[PDB]
C-alpha cells in the first residue's frame, strides 16, 4: 500500500547521522563505542526482564533514566543508554518517534560533568578486560 513517509525519513536521517558521528569520533572514542556495545549487551536481558518484572509513554522510561543518572556511575549510565536503545527498538512509528527524541534528551541533558572522564576510564578498562 502506501508508505509511512515519516518512518522512511527517520530511517534515512538516523543512519546518515549515525555515519556522520562515527566518522567524527576520535580513535580513543571509537574504542569506547565498541566497549559500550558489548557492555550494553550484558545489561540488555537483565534490563528487559526487569521491565517485564513490572508493567507488561516517554514518561516512565524518562523517569528511569532520570533515576539512573541521579548523583551515578558508569554502570548506571550504561544501563540508561541501553534503556534508551531498547525503547528505540519499539518506538519506530509516528508519535513514538517523538517519545524517543524526548527520552534521548533526558539522557544527554542529565549526564554529569564527570561522565567524560569517568566513562573514559571505565569504558577503556572494559575494553582491556574484553580483549
Amino acid at each position: 500500500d502506501d508508505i509511512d513517509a515519516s518512518a522512511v525519513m527517520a530511517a534515512y536521517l538516523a543512519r546518515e547521522y549515525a555515519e556522520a558521528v562515527e566518522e567524527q569520533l576520535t580513535p580513543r572514542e571509537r574504542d569506547a563505542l565498541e566497549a559500550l556495545r558489548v557492555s550494553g549487551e550484558e545489561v540488555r536481558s537483565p534490563l528487559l526482564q526487569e521491565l517485564s518484572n513490572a508493567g507488561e509513554n516517554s514518561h516512565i522510561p524518562a523517569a528511569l533514566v532520570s533515576a539512573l543518572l541521579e548523583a551515578t556511575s558508569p554502570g548506571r549510565m550504561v544501563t540508561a543508554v541501553e534503556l534508551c536503545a531498547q525503547m528505540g527498538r519499539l518506538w519506530t512509528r509516528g508519535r513514538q518517534l517523538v517519545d524517543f527524541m524526548r527520552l534521548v534528551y533526558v539522557l544527554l541533558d542529565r549526564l554529569p560533568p564527570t561522565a567524560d572522564e569517568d566513562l573514559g576510564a571505565w569504558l577503556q578498562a572494559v575494553a582491556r578486560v574484553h580483549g
Binding site: 550484558e42 534490563l47 513490572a54 528511569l64 554502570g75 548506571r76 544501563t79 578498562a125 572494559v126
Partner: peptide, 26 residues
C-alpha cells in the same frame, strides 16, 4: 503506579551498580 516506577528504578540501579564492577573484573 508511580511507586511501581520507584521500585523498578531501584532494580535498574542495582543492575547498574553490578554492571559497574562486573565489567572491570576477572
Amino acid at each position: 503506579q508511580d511507586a511501581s516506577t520507584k521500585k523498578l528504578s531501584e532494580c535498574l540501579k542495582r543492575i547498574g551498580d553490578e554492571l559497574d564492577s562486573n565489567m572491570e573484573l576477572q
